[PDB]
Coordinates of C-alpha atoms and ligand atoms in Angstrom, one line a residue:
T278 CA 0.0 -0.2 0.0
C279 CA 1.2 3.7 -0.4
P280 CA 3.1 5.2 2.0
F281 CA 1.7 8.2 3.4
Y282 CA 5.0 10.6 2.7
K283 CA 4.2 9.8 -1.5
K284 CA 0.8 11.8 -0.7
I285 CA -0.1 15.2 -1.4
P286 CA -2.8 16.4 1.5
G287 CA -6.1 18.2 -0.2
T288 CA -5.3 17.4 -3.4
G289 CA -5.8 13.7 -5.9
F290 CA -2.0 13.9 -6.5
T291 CA 1.1 11.3 -5.6
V292 CA 4.3 11.7 -6.2
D293 CA 7.0 8.5 -7.5
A294 CA 4.1 5.7 -6.7
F295 CA 3.8 3.4 -9.4
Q296 CA 4.4 0.2 -7.6
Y297 CA 1.4 0.3 -5.8
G298 CA -0.8 -0.8 -8.6
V299 CA -4.2 1.9 -8.9
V300 CA -3.7 4.2 -5.8
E301 CA -7.5 5.0 -4.3
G302 CA -8.3 8.6 -4.6
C303 CA -5.5 9.3 -7.1
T304 CA -6.1 11.7 -10.3
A305 CA -2.4 12.0 -11.4
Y306 CA 0.6 10.6 -11.0
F307 CA 3.7 13.1 -10.6
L308 CA 7.3 11.5 -11.4
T309 CA 10.5 13.6 -10.3
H310 CA 12.9 11.2 -12.0
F311 CA 14.1 8.7 -14.5
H312 CA 15.6 6.2 -11.6
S313 CA 14.3 2.7 -11.2
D314 CA 13.2 2.8 -7.3
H315 CA 10.9 5.7 -8.4
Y316 CA 9.6 5.1 -11.5
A317 CA 9.2 1.0 -10.8
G318 CA 6.2 0.1 -12.4
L319 CA 5.8 2.3 -15.5
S320 CA 5.1 0.7 -19.1
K321 CA 3.2 0.9 -22.0
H322 CA 0.1 -0.4 -20.2
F323 CA -0.1 2.6 -17.7
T324 CA -3.3 5.0 -18.9
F325 CA -3.3 7.3 -16.0
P326 CA -1.5 10.9 -16.3
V327 CA 2.0 11.2 -15.4
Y328 CA 3.4 14.9 -14.9
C329 CA 7.4 15.1 -15.0
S330 CA 9.9 17.4 -17.0
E331 CA 10.7 17.1 -20.8
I332 CA 13.5 14.9 -20.7
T333 CA 11.8 12.7 -17.8
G334 CA 8.9 12.7 -21.0
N335 CA 11.3 11.5 -23.1
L336 CA 12.7 8.4 -21.2
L337 CA 9.3 7.3 -20.4
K338 CA 8.5 7.5 -24.2
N339 CA 11.7 6.1 -25.4
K340 CA 12.9 3.5 -23.2
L341 CA 9.4 2.3 -21.1
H342 CA 7.1 2.7 -24.2
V343 CA 4.7 4.5 -21.9
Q344 CA 2.5 6.1 -24.5
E345 CA 2.5 9.7 -25.7
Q346 CA -1.2 10.7 -24.8
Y347 CA -0.6 9.7 -21.0
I348 CA 2.8 12.0 -20.9
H349 CA 2.7 15.4 -19.6
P350 CA 5.8 17.4 -19.8
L351 CA 5.8 20.8 -18.0
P352 CA 8.4 23.3 -18.5
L353 CA 10.4 24.4 -15.5
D354 CA 10.3 27.7 -13.9
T355 CA 6.5 28.1 -15.0
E356 CA 3.5 28.4 -13.0
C357 CA 0.9 25.6 -14.7
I358 CA -2.3 24.3 -13.6
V359 CA -3.1 20.5 -12.9
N360 CA -6.6 19.6 -12.1
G361 CA -7.3 23.3 -10.8
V362 CA -4.0 23.4 -8.6
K363 CA -1.1 25.8 -9.5
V364 CA 2.1 23.7 -9.5
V365 CA 6.3 24.6 -10.2
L366 CA 8.8 22.2 -11.3
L367 CA 12.3 23.4 -9.9
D368 CA 15.9 22.2 -11.0
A369 CA 16.8 19.4 -8.2
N370 CA 20.6 19.8 -9.1
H371 CA 20.4 15.8 -9.0
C372 CA 20.6 13.7 -12.5
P373 CA 19.6 15.3 -16.1
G374 CA 15.5 15.7 -15.8
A375 CA 15.5 15.6 -12.3
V376 CA 12.8 18.4 -10.3
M377 CA 11.7 19.7 -7.0
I378 CA 7.6 20.0 -7.1
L379 CA 6.0 23.4 -5.7
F380 CA 2.3 22.4 -5.0
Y381 CA -0.4 26.0 -3.9
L382 CA -2.9 24.4 -2.4
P383 CA -6.5 26.0 -2.9
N384 CA -6.7 26.4 1.0
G385 CA -3.4 28.6 0.9
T386 CA -1.1 26.0 1.9
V387 CA 2.5 25.4 0.2
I388 CA 4.4 22.1 -0.6
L389 CA 7.9 21.7 -1.6
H390 CA 8.4 18.0 -2.5
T391 CA 12.3 17.7 -3.2
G392 CA 12.2 14.4 -5.1
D393 CA 16.2 13.4 -4.7
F394 CA 18.2 16.6 -4.8
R395 CA 21.5 18.0 -4.2
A396 CA 20.7 21.5 -2.3
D397 CA 22.9 24.2 -3.5
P398 CA 22.8 28.2 -2.9
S399 CA 21.4 28.8 -6.2
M400 CA 18.1 27.4 -5.1
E401 CA 18.0 30.3 -2.7
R402 CA 16.9 32.6 -5.9
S403 CA 14.6 30.5 -8.0
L404 CA 10.9 31.3 -7.3
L405 CA 11.2 29.8 -3.7
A406 CA 12.2 33.1 -2.7
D407 CA 9.0 34.7 -3.5
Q408 CA 6.5 32.5 -0.9
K409 CA 6.8 30.7 2.6
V410 CA 6.5 26.9 2.6
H411 CA 4.4 25.1 5.3
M412 CA 5.4 21.4 4.3
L413 CA 8.5 20.0 3.1
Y414 CA 8.6 16.4 1.9
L415 CA 12.7 16.1 2.0
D416 CA 15.2 13.9 0.4
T417 CA 17.4 12.9 3.7
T418 CA 19.5 10.4 2.0
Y419 CA 22.6 11.4 4.0
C420 CA 21.1 13.4 7.1
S421 CA 24.0 12.5 9.3
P422 CA 26.7 15.0 10.2
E423 CA 29.9 12.2 9.0
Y424 CA 28.7 13.0 5.5
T425 CA 30.7 15.5 4.2
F426 CA 31.9 15.1 0.8
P427 CA 33.8 17.7 -1.7
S428 CA 31.8 19.4 -4.3
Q429 CA 31.4 18.0 -7.6
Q430 CA 33.7 20.2 -8.9
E431 CA 36.8 19.4 -7.0
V432 CA 35.9 15.2 -7.7
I433 CA 36.1 16.3 -11.7
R434 CA 39.4 18.3 -11.0
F435 CA 40.8 14.8 -9.7
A436 CA 39.5 12.6 -12.4
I437 CA 40.5 14.8 -15.3
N438 CA 44.1 15.4 -13.8
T439 CA 44.3 11.6 -12.9
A440 CA 43.2 10.6 -16.3
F441 CA 45.4 12.9 -18.8
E442 CA 48.3 12.2 -16.3
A443 CA 47.9 8.3 -17.1
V444 CA 47.6 8.3 -20.7
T445 CA 50.4 11.2 -21.3
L446 CA 52.8 8.5 -19.7
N447 CA 51.3 5.6 -21.4
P448 CA 49.1 6.0 -24.6
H449 CA 48.2 2.4 -24.7
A450 CA 46.2 3.0 -21.3
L451 CA 42.0 2.4 -21.5
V452 CA 40.0 4.9 -19.1
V453 CA 36.9 2.9 -18.1
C454 CA 34.0 4.7 -16.2
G455 CA 31.6 2.5 -14.5
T456 CA 27.3 3.4 -14.8
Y457 CA 24.1 2.2 -13.6
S458 CA 21.3 4.9 -14.4
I459 CA 21.2 8.1 -15.5
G460 CA 23.6 10.7 -14.0
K461 CA 26.8 11.6 -12.9
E462 CA 27.4 12.0 -17.1
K463 CA 29.9 14.8 -16.2
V464 CA 32.5 12.2 -14.9
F465 CA 33.1 10.3 -17.9
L466 CA 32.7 13.4 -20.8
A467 CA 34.8 15.6 -18.6
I468 CA 37.4 12.7 -19.0
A469 CA 37.0 12.3 -23.0
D470 CA 37.1 16.0 -23.5
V471 CA 40.6 16.5 -21.8
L472 CA 41.9 13.3 -24.0
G473 CA 40.3 14.2 -27.1
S474 CA 38.5 11.1 -27.2
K475 CA 34.9 10.4 -27.7
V476 CA 33.2 8.0 -25.0
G477 CA 32.1 4.5 -26.6
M478 CA 29.5 2.5 -24.9
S479 CA 26.8 -0.1 -26.0
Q480 CA 23.5 1.0 -28.5
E481 CA 21.4 0.7 -25.2
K482 CA 23.3 3.2 -23.0
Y483 CA 24.0 5.5 -26.0
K484 CA 20.0 5.5 -26.8
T485 CA 19.4 6.4 -23.2
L486 CA 22.0 9.5 -23.5
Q487 CA 20.4 10.7 -26.9
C488 CA 17.1 11.2 -24.8
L489 CA 18.7 14.3 -22.7
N490 CA 19.0 17.4 -24.6
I491 CA 22.5 17.6 -24.0
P492 CA 23.9 19.9 -26.3
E493 CA 27.1 18.5 -28.5
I494 CA 26.2 15.1 -27.2
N495 CA 27.0 13.6 -30.7
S496 CA 30.1 15.6 -30.7
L497 CA 31.1 13.6 -27.2
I498 CA 29.8 10.0 -27.3
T499 CA 29.6 7.0 -29.9
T500 CA 28.9 3.5 -30.5
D501 CA 32.4 2.9 -32.1
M502 CA 34.3 1.8 -28.9
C503 CA 37.4 0.9 -31.4
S504 CA 37.7 4.5 -32.2
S505 CA 37.5 5.6 -28.6
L506 CA 39.7 5.6 -25.2
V507 CA 37.0 6.1 -22.6
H508 CA 34.7 3.1 -22.3
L509 CA 31.2 2.9 -20.1
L510 CA 30.2 -0.4 -18.7
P511 CA 28.0 -1.7 -16.5
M512 CA 29.0 -0.8 -12.6
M513 CA 29.0 -4.4 -12.0
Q514 CA 31.9 -5.1 -14.2
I515 CA 34.2 -2.5 -12.5
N516 CA 36.0 -5.1 -10.8
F517 CA 39.3 -6.9 -11.3
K518 CA 37.8 -9.9 -13.3
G519 CA 35.3 -7.9 -14.8
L520 CA 38.2 -5.5 -16.6
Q521 CA 40.7 -8.2 -17.2
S522 CA 38.0 -9.5 -19.5
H523 CA 37.2 -6.2 -20.9
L524 CA 40.7 -5.5 -21.8
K525 CA 41.0 -9.1 -23.4
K526 CA 38.1 -8.3 -26.1
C527 CA 40.1 -4.7 -26.7
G528 CA 42.4 -6.9 -29.1
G529 CA 45.7 -5.6 -27.9
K530 CA 44.9 -2.1 -28.4
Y531 CA 45.5 -1.4 -24.9
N532 CA 47.8 -2.8 -22.0
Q533 CA 46.8 -0.7 -18.7
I534 CA 43.6 -0.4 -17.5
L535 CA 42.4 2.8 -15.3
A536 CA 39.1 2.8 -14.1
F537 CA 36.8 4.9 -11.8
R538 CA 33.7 4.4 -9.9
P539 CA 31.6 6.9 -9.3
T540 CA 30.2 6.0 -5.6
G541 CA 27.5 8.4 -3.2
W542 CA 29.6 8.5 -0.1
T543 CA 32.5 5.9 1.7
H544 CA 33.9 5.9 5.5
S545 CA 37.5 7.4 3.7
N546 CA 35.8 10.6 3.8
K547 CA 36.0 10.6 7.3
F548 CA 39.9 10.6 7.1
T549 CA 41.0 11.5 3.7
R550 CA 40.9 14.9 1.4
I551 CA 40.2 14.4 -2.2
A552 CA 43.8 14.9 -3.4
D553 CA 45.0 12.0 -1.1
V554 CA 42.8 9.4 -2.8
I555 CA 44.3 6.4 -4.2
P556 CA 43.6 3.6 -6.1
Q557 CA 43.3 -0.5 -5.5
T558 CA 45.7 -2.1 -8.3
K559 CA 46.2 -5.6 -9.7
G560 CA 48.6 -5.9 -12.2
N561 CA 48.0 -3.8 -14.8
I562 CA 44.4 -2.6 -13.4
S563 CA 43.6 0.6 -11.6
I564 CA 40.3 1.2 -9.9
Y565 CA 39.6 4.7 -8.1
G566 CA 36.4 4.7 -5.8
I567 CA 35.5 8.9 -6.2
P568 CA 33.2 10.6 -3.9
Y569 CA 30.6 12.3 -6.7
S570 CA 27.2 12.6 -4.8
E571 CA 24.1 14.1 -6.7
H572 CA 22.7 14.1 -2.9
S573 CA 23.1 16.7 -0.6
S574 CA 26.0 16.6 2.1
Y575 CA 24.5 16.8 5.7
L576 CA 25.8 20.8 5.8
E577 CA 24.2 21.4 2.3
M578 CA 21.2 20.1 3.5
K579 CA 21.1 21.7 6.7
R580 CA 22.4 25.1 4.8
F581 CA 18.8 24.4 2.8
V582 CA 16.8 24.0 5.3
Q583 CA 17.5 26.7 7.5
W584 CA 17.2 29.1 5.0
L585 CA 13.7 27.9 4.1
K586 CA 12.1 27.4 7.6
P587 CA 9.3 25.3 6.7
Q588 CA 6.7 24.9 9.6
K589 CA 6.7 20.7 9.2
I590 CA 9.2 18.6 7.9
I591 CA 8.4 15.2 6.5
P592 CA 11.1 13.1 5.7
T593 CA 11.5 10.4 2.3
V594 CA 14.7 8.5 2.9
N595 CA 15.8 6.4 5.8
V596 CA 12.5 6.2 7.4
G597 CA 12.3 2.2 7.7
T598 CA 13.8 2.1 11.5
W599 CA 12.9 3.6 14.5
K600 CA 16.5 4.7 15.4
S601 CA 17.1 6.0 11.9
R602 CA 13.7 8.4 11.8
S603 CA 14.7 9.3 16.0
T604 CA 18.2 10.5 14.7
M605 CA 16.5 12.8 11.9
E606 CA 14.0 14.3 14.1
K607 CA 16.7 15.2 16.6
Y608 CA 18.6 17.2 13.7
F609 CA 15.4 18.9 12.6
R610 CA 14.9 20.1 16.5
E611 CA 18.5 21.2 16.6
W612 CA 18.5 23.1 13.0
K613 CA 15.1 24.9 13.9
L614 CA 16.7 26.1 17.2
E615 CA 19.6 27.1 16.2
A616 CA 18.1 29.2 13.2
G617 CA 15.4 30.6 15.7
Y618 CA 12.1 29.4 13.5
Ligands
NI92 NI1 17.8 9.4 -7.7

């Protein structure tokens, strides 16, 4: 049955609630972004109205074969009317096409649902600045003070520098980047850009990327693996056995693999600066875990909430244990006390 934190009170709306069958009372289904824990249940047989961004709509049509008459894409940063209720979609700084959703209830209540987001001060100058928010449905994925991580820009600098140095020293090295969903595209694209290569990948992953409006993408990606020195592979293949096998498949074109596994967080962040990160090596294979996050750090999340000053916070992540819920509620109280709302 649909959990309560996926239901918008005073409307016929749900958010990311497609794995429950027909939700009793539901007149429109919102989808924040194209990741499988959120879309699980959409297909060509779905015949309710789905509201989402343009890019998420492109992916629904092409990857899942949802029929076009049921897809209702909305422009960002624009007041739109859905079943008599004013709504606005805002950039969530998560993966391509990911949004937050502002709802303006008929009774005057204002609700923000973050979806998955990485808070940023640029958000403090969107249509959020212009009115009060009564309820916040918050992506709390890393709501504990141990979760620190660097900016995306510092992680990309590290990756570009590492790869440019390895290939300059050995022009027969192959660079590999792991992936399992959309998101984190800047990793493999920035590396390709510095080496003056295109990124080679499967036809299916190429198709996915062509759905994302990314300008000059024909210029950065390809399915001709042979002409590329940056290959994208399944995340499950980013291990010593998997990359040994891939290297054999390259026909003696390359004699060394440098691989990157972007990840959310790892405990090494508690002890280690980005500059100090080192690979796991075996034979002619090195694997770098890099802390490229598309969710808020604890301190980014705290700043956002203390800026917004909501009257009630409803967590959407880590809600399944009493100890987690308790812990998050204690931080919310502190934030409120410290900020004086
Ligand atoms: Ni996500």
